Design a binder for this molecule. Structure first.
Ligand SMILES: [Cl-]
Lengths: 381, 383
């Protein structure tokens, strides 16, 4: 092979497929052992399964890869958004209609996204899948990267002209190349789950600004299934978590939305992850490049930062293919530095956008602050 | 009498009525001669298409309610019950509809001619208000005890004294220049084109605003069910293609092209007034026994109401300082009491001025509804 990718997640699996499509062989390393579904294995969307909001560029990226036709089987589009409020300024409704395909994006089930990616990777002869290995050494010289993976008793020694590190927020390769991270924490915790409503969503996403905070209702592939996103202050998560508070969670959703979504009949397990940002100081060190959560972990945004990672993968694929037009060295360090410079503006804009979204959770009645900020009618403050 | 208000506009008339309600006699001066309405059938009241309007806040209506005047003022004042903001963009189409919860919260749009008529009529029936019209103040001096002014009627020279002088004589206030107070001017490179239009569809107390390349185009209701006020900020230098009788059809075509059929056909437009968006601030608002009120203290244009709602709040707070001062002294124009009032108003005026900058800077913001849909983290976008 020519390229080594450390980390076999959504980003790593997607990056290996883009390289294989560009006729670039790749060794993919992953710590966990993948399920070998060999007759066969029936996919069923679980109430406790996680979801991901894909942007239009992410859908287009998978379209060029020829994978969206399969990914669409368990992904639904968002056609409209309905935003409402009822505070000390009046009731207001914001309805936005989509007209271009996937402008509001698609909500895909995570289990289906990884299954399609894993199945297609195993069909590509240019991708050598090496699961059950944990990298424990990484060195560099002027010509190659050297890694030592551990497989129980065996030692695995590999080398390549370029190493792509996509091993998650707690990346091992990032600390091996001596790169620190900056951590920004927020006093918020996102409560996500999957509920079942008597009324179908009809590809409409909902959000209600209440005293409990912004309560989201995203459509799911199931016509009567919805994905809830509910950020709250740290410590307030215990009131809604656990099987003991299943109906209490449904009661808060019912009294907030009333009958706009019908009756909240069932709910799954409520997941909680603190809102924070883990940003690496650098992304390119010699012939090693950080991709995904190894470079930046931005969870509070829609898509959990996955759309930004897919853009990094698409752009890196171009910088490597264009480099191969000039020489046989796909791991040209100056090319990796130029790639990082080309991604700086988009990454900083998303990182700043994440700060705006989290600080916006405190803003109740934002539709009527927009009405006031027009200066058209006379409020009194 | 005892208090002299210089300026017989909407502010001076309101202030004189507020002082009269508090049992405070007041002399009111004005440069223009007022038309005694009486029995002259030649001149009743008409809602002219070239007349100005004012958006009154809830507290402003509450102030006129305490004065027993809103029952008559409502005859030519309409409430805003809904606000519809539309927007079209590359990503799609969005609409925001905001309704009213409590009465008067969205405000009332009153005709300026009717407001001045009711105020002037009520002032003339108030014995505690001495109305002196056709007088122009040509001199203003002051000592430790009184203010001295000299007004001219052409041949008659009027000399008046008072313990307190309330200067409400407009943006080019003579009293502000007499006490030696300069102004600070903050200018924007935009002017606002306002006018009154008539539409085939009734507005039904619904105010509209559409964002486009022309800038934010506002359509607000008026007392006439088919009358609407247009608020249109443009860049300085391009207001000529909309002003003038020869551009009446050019102006109506731009309204029809922006709103389509949401307001029916734009049948008729009045004269287009173009006033520059700017803030004129007096360096000081109180010097001795002279105090500035209205546009004499701060001319505020970009916001709805043209600062009038701020002036009524200024007058309401001023009455509280004057009434309490009279409860402990006979000097209603104590300079230190006026200075304590000015500092207490600094917070309100400064936040209105900052709100003006926020409004003006928002004109350059096209597609604001989509930005709100983006800034909530609901769906995945990319810019
Ligand atoms: Cl105002």
């Amino acid at each position: 092979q020519q390229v080594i990718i450390v980390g076999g997640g959504m980003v790593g699996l997607s990056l290996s497929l883009m390289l294989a499509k560009a006729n670039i062989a790749v060794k993919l390393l992953e710590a966990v052992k993948y399920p070998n579904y060999d007759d066969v294995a029936p996919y069923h969307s679980s109430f406790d399964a996680r979801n991901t909001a894909l942007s239009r560029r992410s859908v287009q990226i998978y379209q060029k890869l020829g994978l969206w036709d399969a990914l669409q089987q368990h992904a639904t589009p968002i056609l409209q958004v309905h935003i409402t409020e009822q505070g000390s300024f009046g009731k207001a409704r914001l309805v936005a209609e989509q007209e271009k395909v996937e402008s509001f994006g698609q909500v895909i089930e995570n289990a289906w996204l990884g299954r399609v990616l894993l199945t297609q990777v195993r069909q590509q002869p240019l991708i050598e899948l090496i699961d059950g290995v944990q990298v424990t050494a990484l060195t560099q010289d002027a010509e190659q990267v050297y890694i030592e993976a551990q497989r129980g008793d065996e030692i695995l020694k590999l080398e390549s002209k370029l190493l792509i590190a996509a091993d998650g927020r707690d990346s091992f390769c990032r600390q091996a190349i001596g790169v620190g991270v900056d951590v920004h924490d927020y006093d918020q915790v996102a409560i996500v789950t999957t509920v079942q409503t008597s009324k179908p969503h009809e590809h409409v996403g909902f959000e209600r600004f209440s005293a409990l905070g912004p309560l989201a209702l995203l459509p799911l592939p199931g016509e009567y299934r919805r994905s809830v996103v509910w950020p709250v202050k740290k410590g307030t998560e215990g009131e809604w978590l656990g099987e003991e508070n299943d109906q209490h969670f449904l009661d808060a959703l019912q009294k907030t939305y009333g009958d706009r979504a019908g009756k909240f009949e069932k709910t799954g397990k409520r997941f909680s992850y603190p809102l924070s940002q883990v940003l690496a100081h650098k992304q390119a060190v010699g012939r090693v490049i950080l991709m995904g959560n190894a470079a930046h972990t931005i969870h509070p945004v829609a898509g959990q930062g996955f759309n930004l990672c897919l853009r990094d993968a698409d752009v890196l694929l171009r910088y490597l293919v264009n480099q191969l037009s000039a020489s046989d060295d796909i791991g040209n360090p100056d090319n990796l530095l130029a790639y990082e410079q080309a991604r700086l503006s988009d990454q900083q804009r998303v990182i700043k956008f994440c700060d705006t979204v989290v600080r916006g959770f405190s803003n109740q009645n934002p539709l009527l602050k927009l009405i006031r900020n027009t200066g058209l009618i006379a409020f009194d403050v």
